């Protein structure tokens, strides 16, 4: 895995801040109390959870 890399369960939400995109992450094996916002550069290996999220947002956009 590597320095502070963990498995993601799902992506819960997104937002932009300072021209940059962040995603709210639910860590696998963890609860809502550990959710963090993460910059895109942290999610290169989450293409699938990102699609599932971007998908659900289209499904009602």
């Amino acid at each position: 895995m590597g320095e502070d890399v963990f498995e993601v369960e799902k992506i819960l939400d997104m937002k932009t801040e300072g021209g940059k995109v962040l995603y709210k992450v639910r860590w696998k094996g963890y609860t809502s109390d550990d959710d963090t916002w993460e910059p895109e550069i942290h999610l290169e290996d989450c293409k699938e959870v990102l699609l599932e999220f971007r998908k659900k947002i289209a499904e009602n956009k």
């Binding site: 890399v5 963990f6 498995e7 993601v8 992450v25 910059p39 942290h42 999610l43 290996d45």
Partner: peptide
Amino acid sequence: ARTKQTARKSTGGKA
């Protein structure tokens, strides 16, 4: 499921 979905977790943040 399908591949391993991983990411860097942030421990800091704006003060």
